[PDB]
Design an enzyme around this catalytic site. Structure first.
Site, PDB file in Angstrom:
ATOM      1  N   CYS A 423       0.826  -1.203   0.000  1.00 30.94           N
ATOM      2  CA  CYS A 423       0.000   0.000   0.000  1.00 30.94           C
ATOM      3  C   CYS A 423       0.862   1.256   0.000  1.00 30.94           C
ATOM      4  O   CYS A 423       0.564   2.223  -0.711  1.00 30.94           O
ATOM      5  CB  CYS A 423      -0.936  -0.012   1.207  1.00 30.94           C
ATOM      6  SG  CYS A 423      -2.573   0.683   0.888  1.00 30.94           S
ATOM      7  N   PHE A 424       1.932   1.260   0.790  1.00 30.72           N
ATOM      8  CA  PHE A 424       2.857   2.384   0.852  1.00 30.72           C
ATOM      9  C   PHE A 424       4.108   2.166   0.012  1.00 30.72           C
ATOM     10  O   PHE A 424       4.993   3.027   0.013  1.00 30.72           O
ATOM     11  CB  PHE A 424       3.266   2.654   2.305  1.00 30.72           C
ATOM     12  CG  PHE A 424       2.251   2.206   3.315  1.00 30.72           C
ATOM     13  CD1 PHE A 424       0.975   2.745   3.324  1.00 30.72           C
ATOM     14  CD2 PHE A 424       2.573   1.242   4.255  1.00 30.72           C
ATOM     15  CE1 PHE A 424       0.041   2.332   4.253  1.00 30.72           C
ATOM     16  CE2 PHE A 424       1.643   0.825   5.186  1.00 30.72           C
ATOM     17  CZ  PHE A 424       0.376   1.370   5.186  1.00 30.72           C
TER      18      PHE A 424
END
Length: 450
Positions: A423-424
């Protein structure tokens, strides 16, 4: 029958031979001076494939995996030189796909699976024209037929790519962008969308059969389902919305229940995971199963009929027993070729680390030694996708976009396995005393993560 057979094989006390075998093979791996071959010991290896074929693949019962995992580097080379070994006693290697290299795996695949249909379609509306023209045709006819496409106002690869672009447009609602992973798409929980999904599966299977690389990306859960593999909790991290984000925080602060809230075309609806889902309170006594039910709803049971139609449409060209050999990561590369992957080396950030740090330098050296397929696998592991953005790696997307790679030091022991958050686009690397240990840990993390 199998029990006594394994007991007999044990009675031969061949262990000392097997160990001895593992020695000489290692020498063949080390010594590059040798000129004769490594196949002089081929029958012996074949013998090891016979004393393990009837064992439990999932001494003489704990020897297959610890041996093949150790000698994969040699077995892959042997198969590369002589692929027919797969049809021979080496076939048992397919039961442990972790050892076969991707190129060998796909060669064997194409060999097994691969053991004119003119049409006219509008360039803009190629999707519907193709759906009308082909979906109603016989399975074998299309399977054994080669397309001769014709654009209205003007011959297959271009059609494949344009269809892939048009099929997953949000307009049709079939596939929607993955939050925090805008590059890829995920299926839709929400007229004739079922036949459209069936055609999607059909065309994807045909692209696989025709070696045409569809420049499209799907979520991890889609490829886990097409392979029949289970779905883990980390999967929603690719498309974990605000509701899924609060699940981590809860896992007393919130009076959670086995219920979900959905907004379906202007209608608020409630989904019950289990009997009395709204009434059945969520507690520490029923959270380990609550998370499992939540992920099951999020990934599998919410798209039941559509995914079933997709699977049956795709399987018409590829058997489940054939595609089972591949892994989740490998399917990305199979469908959409291998990303090329320098700029990624420079377009990066470090937390508790520096570009000149020993750990960072060792990591860069290990990554450099990796091949194109291994680099693509690492990219998939880190960012969650095996497609470099349309621009340099400095332009990586995210929840808010422009989220570039960031490595983070881990304070755990050197035995710790490096982790990641797609996600990051975040990686977590522990310090390592030796470069070889770092390389082995990275390889284990990337391969075993899926």
């Amino acid at each position: 029958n199998v029990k006594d057979l394994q007991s007999l094989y044990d009675k031969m006390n061949g262990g000392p031979v097997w160990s001895s075998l593992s020695e000489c093979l290692s020498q063949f791996e080390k010594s590059q001076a040798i000129n004769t071959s490594a196949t002089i010991l081929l029958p012996l290896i074949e013998s090891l494939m016979v004393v393990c074929r009837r064992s439990d693949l999932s001494r003489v019962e704990n020897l297959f995996f610890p041996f093949t995992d150790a000698h994969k580097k040699l077995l892959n080379q042997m198969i590369r030189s002589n692929p027919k070994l797969m049809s021979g006693p080496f076939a048992l290697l397919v039961k442990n796909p972790k050892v076969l290299d991707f190129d060998n795996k796909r060669y064997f695949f194409n060999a097994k699976l691969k053991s004119k249909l003119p049409i006219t379609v509008r360039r803009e509306q190629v999707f519907l024209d193709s759906y009308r023209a082909l979906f109603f045709k016989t399975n074998d006819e299309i399977k054994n037929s080669k397309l001769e496409i014709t654009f209205k106002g003007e011959v297959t690869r271009e059609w494949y790519q344009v269809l892939s672009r048009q099929m997953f447009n949000p307009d049709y609602a079939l596939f929607l962008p993955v939050p925090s992973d805008k590059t890829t798409f995920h299926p839709n929980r929400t007229p004739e969308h079922l036949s459209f999904f069936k055609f999607i599966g059909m065309i994807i299977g045909k692209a696989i059969r025709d070696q045409c690389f569809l420049d499209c990306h799907f979520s991890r859960e889609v490829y886990k389902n097409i392979l029949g593999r289970p779905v883990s909790l980390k999967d929603m991290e690719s498309l974990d919305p605000d509701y899924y984000k609060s699940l981590v925080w809860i896992l007393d602060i919130i009076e959670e229940t086995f219920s979900v809230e959905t907004d379906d075309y202007g209608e608020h609806k409630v989904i019950n995971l289990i009997e009395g889902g709204k009434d059945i309170i969520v507690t520490e006594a029923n959270k380990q199963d609550y998370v499992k039910k939540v992920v099951e709803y999020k990934l599998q049971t919410s798209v039941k009929e559509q995914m079933d139609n997709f699977l049956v449409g795709f399987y018409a060209l590829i058997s489940k027993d054939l595609i089972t050999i591949f892994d989740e990561q490998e399917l990305e590369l199979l469908i959409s070729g291998l990303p090329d992957i320098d700029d990624w080396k420079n377009n990066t950030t470090y937390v508790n680390y520096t570009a000149t740090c020993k750990e960072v330098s060792y990591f860069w050296r290990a990554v450099r030694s990796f091949d194109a397929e291994e680099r693509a696998k690492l990219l998939q592991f880190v960012t969650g996708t095996s497609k470099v953005p349309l621009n340099g790696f400095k332009e990586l997307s995210g929840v808010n976009g422009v989220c570039k790679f960031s490595i983070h030091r881990d304070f755990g022991s050197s035995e710790r396995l490096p982790s990641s958050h797609t996600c990051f686009n975040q990686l977590n690397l522990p310090p390592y005393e030796s470069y070889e240990t770092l390389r082995g840990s990275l390889l284990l993390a990337i391969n075993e993560g899926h």
